[PDB]
Amino acid sequence: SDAVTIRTRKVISNPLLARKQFVVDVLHPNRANVSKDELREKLAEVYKAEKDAVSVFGFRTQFGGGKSVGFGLVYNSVAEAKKFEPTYRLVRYGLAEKVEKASRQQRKQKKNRDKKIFGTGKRLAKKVARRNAD
Template identity: 40%
Template sequence: MELKILEKKDNPLLHRVEVKFEVSHPKSKTPSRDEVRNLLAANLNADKNRVILDNMHTPFGSTTTTGFAKIYDDVENAKKIEPDYILIRNKLIEKKEEE
């Protein structure tokens, strides 16, 4: 699996770096969100908990996944800014049980 950063933009107002990326995964399935977060954290020298994967898309029959991620300065800023469903997808908070 190979990661290529297509665009990297600093957003000081929201205390984050926004990244558009492409993951090449020849002869294998689409990588999980967790695998992509680990790959982004390793390549951008960031803690995995600060990496918020917003979206990923793999066209049918393709071995390339494109996506958008945000790397926050700290986890607290991510929890203040991001909606709950994104935080749940990225395993930063637990899903609330409905009664």
């Protein structure tokens, strides 16, 4: 393969969020696919963007290969890129960390078990220790 080409269309400036929104389309006549991080770096060197401050999220390849169309947006000043952005995408680009939590059933069971305790249960714990002691 010789090259892909990335064209940005319908560019909208959104100063309400300090960002620019656009529809990327890439012509990759040979390779297979997009290699999305290469597009992030390419859009970084297109405007001036420091590629950890960009995010392209929507992508789908046209029928019969070659053309892939998606939606992508650039934030200036990567602090706002961490600010006005959903957490799943920031984890997806490695600029955040996924928290681990128990699954929905365990959380619901724990909430509906400590709905049966009034107060801290320190009196209940002390009382049950004393009352099964003798």
